[PDB]
Curated annotation (Swiss-Prot), chains A, F, G, H:
Ca(2+) 4 binds at D125, D127, D129, Q131, E136. The gene is CALM1. Changing N49I: In CPVT4; increased RYR2 calcium-release channel activity; not changed calcium-dependent inactivation of L-type calcium channel; not changed protein abundance; not changed structure; not changed thermal stability both in the absence and presence of calcium; no effect on the calcium binding affinity; significantly increased binding of RYR2; increased ryanodine-sensitive calcium-release channel activity; decreased of KCNN2 calcium-activated potassium channel activity; not changed KCNN2 expression; not changed KCNN2 location at membrane. Residues 3-38, 39-74, 76-111, 112-144 form the EF-hand domain. This is Calmodulin-1. The modification Phosphotyrosine is found at Y95, Y134.
Swiss-Prot record, chains B, C, D, E:
Homotetramer; forms a functional homotetrameric channel resulting in the expression of a small M-current. Heterotetramer with KCNQ3; forms heterotetrameric M-channel responsible for the native M-current. Heterotetramer with KCNQ1; forms a functional voltage-gated potassium channel. Interacts (via C-terminus) with calmodulin/CALM1; forms a heterooctameric structure (with 4:4 KCNQ1:CALM stoichiometry); the interaction is calcium-independent, constitutive and participates in the channel function. It comes from Homo sapiens (Human). Residues 197-217 dip into the membrane without crossing it. Residues 268-276, 289-296 are annotated as: Interaction with CALM. The chain crosses the membrane at residues 24-44, 55-75, 99-119, 128-150, 165-185, 224-244. This is Potassium voltage-gated channel subfamily KQT member 5. The chain holds residues 103 to 576 of 932 of the full protein. Residues 45-54, 120-127, 186-196, 218-223 are extracellular.
Length: 144, 344, 344, 344, 344, 144, 144, 144
């Protein structure tokens, strides 16, 4: 609790950088520009619309506290991730192929570095004729 | 290699059992026939003339069913470990906690107790077996996953509730009026139209096209009224079947068109990539900030998946057209603004 | 706070009574069952063997129905004051002037008079009660608001009038011809085909698939003709039910697609804003001119609402496409005119 | 003023008679009932017990029908002069040459001869009247203009010919096989299954759901086979009615959508304007050249009308989209060619 | 000229026989009637009273059928040489190797043997003829090319498998429950409800609307339960016919819309042109390189034809719209890039 | 009657400004320009089409007299306004929420000044947990 | 016959103006330009496609002879003109109103001079409350 | 076998022109430019996509060997060519008309030289009233 709130406050100190207490489009655009993430107005506004509920365009501090105090290790998260993985399933056998996932991850959706492709290839078991199950991945990422 | 083959055969058995597809259905069909046969034999055991050989055949088939069913139960429990959600002894217990698994095991135990009671052959045991020979149908009940047939029927009925209520209401009014008129014209000549309840029974049998013939109008005026009201009410009483059949066919066509497309692929890819980035994310405070940002993107991708859970429909294509039209129009507005600035 | 809670509970009761939605329908379902039960009991009171206990049960249920119904009438009258259209004693009288409200109160009074007559137990009173036990069905009649079932059935029937007339006409011709042929081949051997009226009765019973069995062809030529004409005419006589069911399902699908959209929102907003501006409008002659202008805009918004009363259809999307295409084309014409003026 | 009122009343009568629309149908409905009543009375004249009063009522109604029908014939002949196509004595003769007009006048003459024969009351006359009482149905036959019901039924049947043939073929095979199996299992125990013809009659009565009950399986194996084959064949035999009803409803929906639009208005305006220009067209050789040009444009407008006789469909909207897309694309190609010439 | 007329008449006969279209169907209709007549006569030969004249007529018609059928077989074999695929003696043998051709020739030989046996008139021959009079139906079976009716029925049934299974499952449950309740209320008063098998037979006859009348509830509670469950289960049992009929009609409408268009014309033209170029293709090594290139283009055109074998659908029009929208958008992007370079 | 016709004539004196007796697009465009209403050709032509019935583009004096002599306190006006208000109704409870109406009025349709938003907020009863019925509004605006 | 062919030849002498014997787009474009009909390439090509059947773009002399030898007083012409007039019919009463036809002729389709509008108004009977039947018009124009 | 592989190698020597062993878009674009076939980037890329199965854009030598070792005289080729010809069939009489084929070949699809039109006209039998069957054409072109 105390460690959590201390970490949250020390993070928001860099996130906000002053006494305003609210984050604007430029406020986090500077953060992503420092990391070289190439922020865009459209994606930033879509993120803004993904937090607020009144449409005023400002992220309220109580809203941030409520949305962030809860954790991502929820019950429905496992089902949603399972369905998302099943979207890229062949014949419903519950496994993700090496070549299929290698093509899908880099090409479909947001592109991924081939370095991280070798990373997840070596992270999973190289045995099993190059076949890896994803249910354990959902289990380990749901509860972290 | 042993582990790989073990997991592969476990997955194959779990597929043919819990998630049938294609030729796997063959197996289920077989089991269905078996259950159906038992039911038929039970029906043939209530006939006093055929009870002997039917009871013997039911005993033999009950044994065969016990062996095959217990084998299926054991194989299903073993194959539950294909997915890590039910791996280990704790996972197998969690699998055994499923409502249909517990229904299957109580059905098995009831059948074993029935066999033991027949071995004892008590009078109370005989009554118990006669009462409990019906429990096998629960297996057939288990086939539709989570009551899919009931949910489909309820959805289609609710979608057409007003039409079905209209059909039944007008048909009931026609039934009442026609029965009353035929009763009035048939009171004195026909002994099977003595009371209005008899006329209502006749009208129900007639307008449903059952036509038992136990009650029929004998007077010619009664026959003319019966013919006219028969045409009307017969048209009215067959309406629900036509309404529901056409609704089912339209729903099938819409589902075919919807399935033809694909919507959730991009949100699924977004969820996978943001999950991967958040996993790989774990000055150190800046790295923690990046972790928080990745979890934030993960939540956004999850919300996008949740909102795209809804299937395609006419509003989706309409709004896609609206977005394309607006993009074209605004882009041409900018183009002509630039061109008039050039000319100006 | 008392006034707020008073109005809230009044609105809740008026909602569950006059404008049912969701769980409110439960209540109506209950009342329907009650009415239905009464009817069934009345039917069971015409049977001489069951008349005693059925009459006693009908008396008890008639009392219960009286209590519940009067309670519902009083609650409906009280909740009519939720909307200011029926507020006050004048508004409550205006509510009581509604045709279904007066039907309900005369039904109540008739039931009270029936109970009083049973208390008196006169012979003329007994006949009056036997005649007036049917009046309860009027409540069930009141359920569909302004004859919604009748209007829906009439709309669908009129939309398919030509097809239904074709089906009935060809079916009638097939009936006449088949009855005549079976009569010709069955005259001398079958005593139930003595006259052409008997053959027509047989054909009506057969082609409707009622099949009483009181008249059936005995000769083999008669049976062959009956089989062929049965196939033909049976296909023809079941046509209206299929036509109307498919029409109902298509109408339901079209209504779902139409409802999916939304059209009157913008005209409603325009009407609200112009009404507000006209309300706020009240040199002074210039202010009166502004008031007149606002009322003029109000009339235009009202006319736009009236013309948008029609629901969405294929012509609406077609004309939207035409407008978009014309806008794009004319804008590009202007763009190329400017560009050729620049080049020229 | 007399000529104007004369022509107006003539047009009104010709409208209510030859081209009914709206309330005019009321009149036709009346006449239909009249004809129907006659038919019913004729049916009631074949019953020996009711022949007296039915014959008297048929005589009175035959007179009434004669008076009304002759009045209608005279009024129709008079109102044929509303349109100049049938104006004058030659035009009235041309109207009287229409097949349904000659059918109506021979029906009238036959009815007059029937009345005269009844006045004579000869035995041969009595037989002639009994035979010719059926001729009235020809009027009812005349109602559908140029066999509209027959054409609609034929169009829908031909559109679904493969499906109907499939349904009937599989149903016939199921009938044959089920009848043979029930005959085999019912040969020795049931006297109504003595021959295979009896089994075929039973199967025809059963799979059509007529169910006379004159033949029914008594053995339990026969009943099980009958139940299974009943489910199958009953599903198969009701298929044509559902297919044709759904086809009718789909055709009605398509016709509604098509009618909603309008296509021939522009070709009709072109035909009218070119006809007017050619009419007004009549150095003089140059004027004759202009006349020839106007007649040439008239022929082109006529060909455009002929090709637009086809109603709207999916190909029309698809080709309209293709034309719009091609126009936009080519215009933007020209625009960018000009812009690159400017930049180059 | 002799060869040209020979080939033309051969093509005409092969068209009317193997690929009927339009008036050619007339011929097939005739043959169908012939076969049907034979079957009817065979059915009339099982009746002991009519066996004499029916057998004589069957002999005469069997002869006529032999003559006509052998003539048709010979003409079909001769007309097989219209297409070069079956030209020559080897080609005629290849034609005779077709499964339906061999079925036709064994049917012919069986009929010839039947005639010879009747000429001998042996008892074993008589039994053989009685058994083999059914073989004629194989011709009627041959009519649908490659089981088109079976394939269409299977496709539509599989498309609606879930709905049909739902309907049958719920109908079976309603049947079981209603039969049990009527059995419970009818056990002691009705002798035709002695066992549960009797109640199941009654429920099957009732919910299918067959209504034999051999079993009917006599108690009033039984009649009320029968009425309610009759309404429910009757609605459920007629569902498959409505579902399949609506599916057939929707498939017919979709096929009409699809056929209206044309897709494979361009790939067919590409295949023809590349085949022609490759044919005409045959320094010389460069010419061989050109031949290889033309064969490569031929393979590409073949693959395009194979992928365009699929008929039009909603995905095709959706992707055409997507391609058009993308082309417009990218072209306007290039246009505005050029215009801003000009302004910049 | 006499007061009504006198008011109508004195209004049309400023509306027309001469002896023409007809109002053109510019004739009322000047009126809206004087009040700063920003007249537009499209809206003026749509209004013109909303009065005439022959398509000639000129508002006839008898047509104006007929269309204006009648009043807006008609029977069907109440039903049309009730339906228009019901379009912006939630769950059919017969009330318009403060926040819902505040958002709808300003955002949806023609924009409205927040000053008039406070005006209608204070015009209705501030009690009732910020909930106001609209049926009385229809009753009072139909008959004025 | 002889008079007809003489008229046709003397007309084609001016139509063709040389020994080519065929009419091109410009060949008749000059004719319509002399009369001030404003010829257009699209309409001329559509007319060309309305005569030929092979798509070669040239009007054959035998084709012209065949297409022109026949007259417009055909049986189906009456039905086609009747249907075209019925397209502009109200309630199917078999009459064309003065105002309705006046609006349709000038506005819908190719525009017509108001002089010819007065011409056809005075050509028909001015009596009958301004209502004229069109069946007699079809009868008189079909057979000329 | 030996003659076949020798011909294939001597053809690929000119096709590749070096030791790379793979053909790029320009590698065959030069070949079609030498023959004056006017190569295009879109058609070349479509051909490339018609050979590879991995999407890498490079034609593998084993893939070329496998795809080329097999011959075009396959069973399904006859059926596919028969269906393609039947697409341009009138009333299903199994013949291709002289005028119909002459129009279709030149106009529809890729254009063809009229010289080759006279070539195929003279190649087939000029007898038979200008009618030629195409089944024999499929038979002769399937097996070469």
């Amino acid at each position: 609790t105390e460690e959590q709130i201390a970490e949250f406050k020390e993070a928001f100190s860099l996130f906000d950088k002053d006494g305003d207490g609210t984050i604007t489009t430029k406020e986090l655009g500077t953060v992503m520009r420092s990391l070289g993430q190439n922020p865009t107005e459209a994606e930033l506004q879509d993120m803004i619309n993904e937090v607020d509920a009144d449409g005023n365009g400002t992220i309220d501090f109580p809203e941030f506290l409520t949305m962030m105090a809860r954790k991502m290790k929820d019950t429905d998260s496992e089902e949603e991730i399972r369905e998302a993985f099943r979207v890229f399933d062949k014949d419903g056998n519950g496994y993700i192929s090496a070549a299929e996932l290698r093509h899908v991850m880099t090409n479909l959706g947001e592109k991924l570095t081939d370095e991280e492709v070798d990373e997840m290839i070596r992270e999973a078991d190289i045995d099993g004729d190059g076949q890896v199950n994803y249910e354990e991945f959902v289990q380990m990422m749901t509860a972290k | 290699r042993r582990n790989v083959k073990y997991r592969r055969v476990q997955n194959y058995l779990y597929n043919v059992l819990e998630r049938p597809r294609g030729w796997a259905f063959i197996y289920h069909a077989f089991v269905f026939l078996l259950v159906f046969g038992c039911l038929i034999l039970s029906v043939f055991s209530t006939i006093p003339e055929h009870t002997k050989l039917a009871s013997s055949c039911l005993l033999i088939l009950e044994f065969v069913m016990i062996v095959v069913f217990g084998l299926e139960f054991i194989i299903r429990i073993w194959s539950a470990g294909c997915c890590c959600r039910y791996r280990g002894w704790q996972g197998r217990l969690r699998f055994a906690r499923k409502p249909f698994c517990v229904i299957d095991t109580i059905v098995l135990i009831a059948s074993i107790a029935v066999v033991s009671a027949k071995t004892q052959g008590n009078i109370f045991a005989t009554s118990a077996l006669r009462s409990l020979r019906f429990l096998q149908i629960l297996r057939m009940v288990r086939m539709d996953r989570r009551g899919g047939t009931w949910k489909l029927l309820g959805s289609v009925v609710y979608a057409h509730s007003k039409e079905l209520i209209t059909a039944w209401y007008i048909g009931f009014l026609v039934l009442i009026f026609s029965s009353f008129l035929v009763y009035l014209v048939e009171k004195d000549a026909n002994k099977e139209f003595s009371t209005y309840a008899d006329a209502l029974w006749w009208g129900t049998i007639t307008l449903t096209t059952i036509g038992y013939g136990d009650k029929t109008p004998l007077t010619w005026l009664g026959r003319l009224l019966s013919a006219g009201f028969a045409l009307l009410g017969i048209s009215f009483f067959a309406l629900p079947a036509g309404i529901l059949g056409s609704g089912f066919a339209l729903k099938v066509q819409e589902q075919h068109r919807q399935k033809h497309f694909e919507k959730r692929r991009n949100p699924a890819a977004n969820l996978i990539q943001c999950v991967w980035r958040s996993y790989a994310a774990d000055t150190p405070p800046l790295k923690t900030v990046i972790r928080a940002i990745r979890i934030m993107k993960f939540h956004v991708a999850k919300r996008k998946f949740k909102e795209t859970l809804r299937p395609y429909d006419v509003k989706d294509v309409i709004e896609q057209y609206s977005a394309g039209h607006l993009d074209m129009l605004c882009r041409i507005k900018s183009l002509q603004t630039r061109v008039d600035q050039i000319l100006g």
